Amino acid sequence: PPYTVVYFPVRGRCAALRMLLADQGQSWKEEVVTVETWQEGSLKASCLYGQLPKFQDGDLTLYQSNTILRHLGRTLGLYGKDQQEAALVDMVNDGVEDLRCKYISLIYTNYEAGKDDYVKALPGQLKPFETLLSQNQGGKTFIVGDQISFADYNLLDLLLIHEVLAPGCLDAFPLLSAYVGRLSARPKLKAFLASPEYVNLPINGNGKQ
Amino acid sequence: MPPYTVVYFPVRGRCAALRMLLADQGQSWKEEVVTVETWQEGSLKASCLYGQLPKFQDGDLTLYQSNTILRHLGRTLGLYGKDQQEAALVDMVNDGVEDLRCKYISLIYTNYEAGKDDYVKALPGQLKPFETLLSQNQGGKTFIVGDQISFADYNLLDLLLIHEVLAPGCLDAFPLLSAYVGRLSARPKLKAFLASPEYVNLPINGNGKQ
Ligand SMILES: N[C@@H](CCC(=O)N[C@@H](CSSC[C@H](NC(=O)CC[C@H](N)C(=O)O)C(=O)NCC(=O)O)C(=O)NCC(=O)O)C(=O)O
Ligand SMILES: N[C@@H](CCC(=O)N[C@@H](CSSC[C@H](NC(=O)CC[C@H](N)C(=O)O)C(=O)NCC(=O)O)C(=O)NCC(=O)O)C(=O)O
Ligand SMILES: [Ca+2]
Ligand SMILES: [Ca+2]
Numbered sequence: 001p002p003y004t005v006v007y008f009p010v011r012g013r014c015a016a017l018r019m020l021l022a023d024q025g026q027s028w029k030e031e032v033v034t035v036e037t038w039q040e041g042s043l044k045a046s047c048l049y050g051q052l053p054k055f056q057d058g059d060l061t062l063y064q065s066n067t068i069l070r071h072l073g074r075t076l077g078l079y080g081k082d083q084q085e086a087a088l089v090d091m092v093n094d095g096v097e098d099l100r101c102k103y104i105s106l107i108y109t110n111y112e113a114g115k116d117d118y119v120k121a122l123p124g125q126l127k128p129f130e131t132l133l134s135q136n137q138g139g140k141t142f143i144v145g146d147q148i149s150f151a152d153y154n155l156l157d158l159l160l161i162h163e164v165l166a167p168g169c170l171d172a173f174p175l176l177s178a179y180v181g182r183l184s185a186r187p188k189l190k191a192f193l194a195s196p197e198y199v200n201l202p203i204n205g206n207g208k209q
Numbered sequence: 210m211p212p213y214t215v216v217y218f219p220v221r222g223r224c225a226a227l228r229m230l231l232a233d234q235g236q237s238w239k240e241e242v243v244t245v246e247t248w249q250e251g252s253l254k255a256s257c258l259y260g261q262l263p264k265f266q267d268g269d270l271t272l273y274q275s276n277t278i279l280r281h282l283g284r285t286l287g288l289y290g291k292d293q294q295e296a297a298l299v300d301m302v303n304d305g306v307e308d309l310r311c312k313y314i315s316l317i318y319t320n321y322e323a324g325k326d327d328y329v330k331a332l333p334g335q336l337k338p339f340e341t342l343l344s345q346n347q348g349g350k351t352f353i354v355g356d357q358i359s360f361a362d363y364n365l366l367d368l369l370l371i372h373e374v375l376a377p378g379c380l381d382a383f384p385l386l387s388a389y390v391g392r393l394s395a396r397p398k399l400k401a402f403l404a405s406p407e408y409v410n411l412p413i414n415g416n417g418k419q
C-alpha cells in the first residue's frame with residue numbers, strides 16, 4: 001500500500017485521516033505502537049516532535065495529524081475548487097482542531113471535574129459548524145463547496161466523538177444531524193465505520209469518552 | 210484602498226507573523242483596532258465565526274483563524290513551497306510552531322508566575338526540532354523549508370523572537386536558529402517594519418506579560 005499510519009491502538013488523532021483514506025478507496029498499512037514500545041523511548045526520540053501519528057507516503061515521512069490531512073487533501077483533490085475555497089476549508093479545519101483540543105484536554109486532564117462545564121458549553125462550540133452548513137447550499141452538500149474535503153472527515157469525527165461524550169448534542173442542529181447521517185452513509189465510509197478495525201478501538205488512550 | 214484588512218486587539222499576538230509576511234512582501238493593508246471596551250460590548254464577538262480574533266478581509270473574503278490567514282497568504286503570494294511535497298513540509302513546520310505557540314500562550318495568560326521556570330527548562334527540547342529541520346536543509350543557510358521563504362518562516366521567526374524576550378539567550382544553544390533570526394530579520398522591508406512604531410509600540414501580548 002502506498003501509505004503507512006503509525007499510531008497507538010486508538011482512534012484519536014488518526015480517526016479522521018483513516019475515514020478519509022477508507023472513503024477515498026485508498027489502501028494503507030497500520031503500524032501499531034504499544035505503550036510498552038513507546039515507553040521504551042527509541043521510536044519517540046526519532047519522531048520530529050516526539051509524538052505520533054507518523055505517516056509515510058512512499059519516500060515521504062510526515063508528522064502532525066493536520067499536516068497529514070492537508071497532504072492527503074492536496075494530493076487527492078479534497079481541498080475545495082480554488083484558493084478561495086481552500087481558505088474556507090482551512091478555516092473549518094482550524095475550528096475543528098480548536099474544539100478537538102478542548103476535547104482532548106477534558107478527556108486526559110480534567111474529565112471528572114470538568115465534564116459538566118464542558119457539556120454546558122458544547123452547544124455554543126458546535127453552532128459555528130451548523131451556521132457554516134446553513135450558508136453552503138442549505139447544508140445539503142459538504143462543509144465547504146460541493147465536493148468533500150479533508151475538513152469534512154475531521155468535522156465528522158469531531159461530531160461522532162461528541163455524540164458519545166454528550167448524547168443528543170446534535171439534536172438542536174438539524175443540518176449537522178443530517179450531515180452526519182449523509183456522510184456516514186457513503187458506502188465505503190459506512191463499511192469502514194461498521195468494521196471492527198474502527199469499532200473495536202477505543203476513542204482515546206485512557207479509556208475515557 | 211488596500212485589499213486587506215486585519216481586525217485585532219492592539220497587540221502583536223497572533224497577528225505578528227502575518228503582519229511580518231505582508232510587510233516583507235511589500236503588501237498594503239488596513240489595521241482595524243478593537244479595544245477591550247468594544248470587545249466587551251459583545252456585538253463584534255458574536256459576529257465572529259468562532260467568537261474570536263483575528264478577523265481578516267481579502268476583498269469580500271472574510272477569514273478567521275490566524276493559521277488560515279497565514280496559509281491563505283501563503284497560497285496567494287506564492288509562499289507555500291515549490292511543489293506538493295514542500296507544501297506538506299511547510300505545513301509540518303507550521304503545525305509545530307502552532308503547538309509551541311499554544312504552550313507559550315498558556316504560560317503567558319494562565320500560569321506565568323508558577324510556570325515560567327518549568328517552561329524555560331523545557332524550552333530547549335521544544336526548540337530543537339526546528340534546529341534539526343534547519344540542519345537538514347542546506348546547512349541551515351536559507352529557509353526552514355526549501356530554498357524560498359514560506360509562511361512558516363514568518364511564523365517560526367515570530368515564535369523565536371518572543372522566546373528570546375521570554376528567555377534571553379535561549380538560542381545560544383541553537384546556532385542555526387540564531388543565525389536564521391538574524392538573517393531573516395535583516396531582509397530590508399522586514400527590518401524596516403520590525404523597527405517601525407506600528408510594530409514596536411504594540412505589546413507582544415494582551416495582559417502585559419512577556
Ligand atoms: N499536533 C500533533 C499532536 C500529536 C499528539 O498530541 N500525540 C500524542 C497522542 S494524542 S494527545 C493525547 C494526550 N494529550 C494530552 O494529554 C494533552 C492534554 C492537555 N490539553 C495538555 O496540553 O496537556 C497525550 O498523549 N499527550 C502527550 C503528553 O503530554 O505526554 C502522543 O504522541 N503522545 C505521546 C507522547 O507525547 O509521548 C498532531 O496533531 O498530531
Ligand atoms: N485558534 C484561533 C485562536 C484565536 C484566539 O485565541 N483569539 C483570542 C486572542 S489570542 S489567545 C490569548 C488568550 N488565551 C488564554 O487566555 C488561555 C490559553 C490557554 N491555552 C487556554 O485555552 O485556556 C485568550 O484571549 N483566550 C480567549 C479567552 O479565554 O477569552 C481572542 O479573540 N480572545 C477573545 C475571546 O475569546 O473572547 C486562531 O489561531 O486565530
Ligand atoms: Ca501492521
Ligand atoms: Ca475532489
Ligand SMILES: [Ca+2]
Nearest residue numbers: 168170171177
Ligand atoms: Ca436522532
Ligand SMILES: [Ca+2]
Nearest residue numbers: 212267268270
Ligand atoms: Ca484578493
Ligand SMILES: [Ca+2]
Nearest residue numbers: 287288357358
Ligand atoms: Ca516563492
